[PDB]
């Protein structure tokens, strides 16, 4: 047969375009700074708003981008790095923040610029500090617990734009605007409605799959469709998670 | 009623192709071209349009007298009277706190 939809959309001419982008998002590199928030802006592909910051490096003014936490305003002064106060919207070394606190834009290793929590409405929880090893345990929004060194930086607050998934998209055109900038195929034609030249689920005198939909992790790429390496299937209840800090 | 032709350029009704109808001394009704409108300066702090300055397109603005492009104050065009009053006060009041923190 021919090449399936899933492979074609991974070729280079289909990658997302950057022409409307504001810049690369991430923290400054300097040990200490005082910054001012210049503007709060929407960026074409992203639902969380961005804040433009201004800080001096040598004598010269320089500009950066952060993801906005909820409760900043244009004109606010913010303090970055060691010796910053625990005030909403400051950036601090993680070892300085008390247990049970909520944080965003956490660095996985020092000076990486911030990864981890970046989507609207999300946060992470500080669950443990180890005074020997200088590690800290953070609980991520998937439920995963990960350990990071005390020298990493983090932003104090919750990411702006929460609640967005409460309102249903009642019409086809509303879905159109949401997926127009994403990589997923919309509208999505079902594999059982294709001919066998186009998809492993195609063909036959009734619309059916005909073979089990759970497939191996090591299966060849042009036929790896369906539920890939599923441990279980169906709507029944699972089992207890195992937890360590 | 007499009807018009496009004398020059394209028929395609873009922003650069505005026209108006005019009556000539020879008693003809003809199309004649129109230049675009101009926006003048807005304040750098608040977005308000500055008083005392003209609105024109960049080339035409540069050919006017300097008096059309400024007011005679600390920031010429640039900022409005309220924003300069705030700036003058702020710089004064900050220096006095530093004076006190130096003396005490």
């Amino acid at each position: 047969g021919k090449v399936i939809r899933t492979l074609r959309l991974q070729k280079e001419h289909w990658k997302r375009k950057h022409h409307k982008s504001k810049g690369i998002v991430g923290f400054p590199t300097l040990k200490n700074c005082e910054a001012t928030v210049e503007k709060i802006v929407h960026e074409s592909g992203r639902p969380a708003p961005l804040a433009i910051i201004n800080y001096k490096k040598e004598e010269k003014n320089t500009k950066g981008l952060l993801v906005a936490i909820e409760g900043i305003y244009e004109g606010q002064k913010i303090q970055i790095g060691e010796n910053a106060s625990l005030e909403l919207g400051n950036v601090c070394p993680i070892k300085e923040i008390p247990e049970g606190s909520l944080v965003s834009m956490v660095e996985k290793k020092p000076k990486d610029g911030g990864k981890y929590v970046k989507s609207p409405g999300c946060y992470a929880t500080i669950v443990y500090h180890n005074k020997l090893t200088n590690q800290t345990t953070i609980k991520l929004p998937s439920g995963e617990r990960v350990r990071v060194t005390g020298e990493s930086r983090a932003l104090l607050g919750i990411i702006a734009g929460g609640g967005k998934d409460d309102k249903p998209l009642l019409k086809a055109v509303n879905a159109y605007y949401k997926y127009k900038t994403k990589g997923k195929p919309w509208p999505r034609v079902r594999g059982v409605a294709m001919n066998p030249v186009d998809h492993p689920h195609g063909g036959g005198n009734h619309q059916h799959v005909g073979h089990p939909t759970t497939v191996s992790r090591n299966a060849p790429v042009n036929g790896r469709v369906g539920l890939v390496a599923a441990r279980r299937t169906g709507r029944k209840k699972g089992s207890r998670k195992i937890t360590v800090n | 009623v007499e009807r018009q032709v496009v004398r020059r350029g394209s028929t395609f009704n873009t922003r650069s192709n505005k026209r108006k109808k005019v009556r000539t001394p020879g008693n003809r009704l003809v199309f004649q071209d129109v230049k675009k409108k101009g926006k003048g300066p807005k304040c750098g702090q608040c977005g308000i349009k500055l008083a005392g300055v003209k609105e024109a397109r960049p080339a035409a603005f540069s050919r006017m007298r300097k008096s059309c492009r400024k007011v005679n104050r600390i920031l010429g065009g640039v900022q409005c009277a309220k924003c300069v009053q705030e700036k003058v006060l702020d710089a004064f009041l900050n220096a006095e706190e530093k004076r006190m923190k130096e003396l005490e």
């Binding site: 005030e87 008390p98 919750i158 702006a160 929460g162 | -």
Partner: protein, 87 residues
Amino acid sequence: SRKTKKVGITGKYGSRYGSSLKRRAMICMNAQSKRYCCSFCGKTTVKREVIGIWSCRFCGKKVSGGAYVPITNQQVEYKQVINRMKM
């Protein structure tokens, strides 16, 4: 105002889309269109520019917020925790 018994702001849609879905949309649609109170000047002149960004029509201040309301439930609580940390 209020010429309808149940349907409220969703009357624009006629008999299309499901009943249950419309009454979820309604909560958000009523919240989006209201004016709210400014923290800086006290007036009730704050409205939404775009998702996450709220703005005052008198004094011009812009502030980060939720998608359909200026302050979300998580924020109203967490703001208090910070005030205690400062003690």
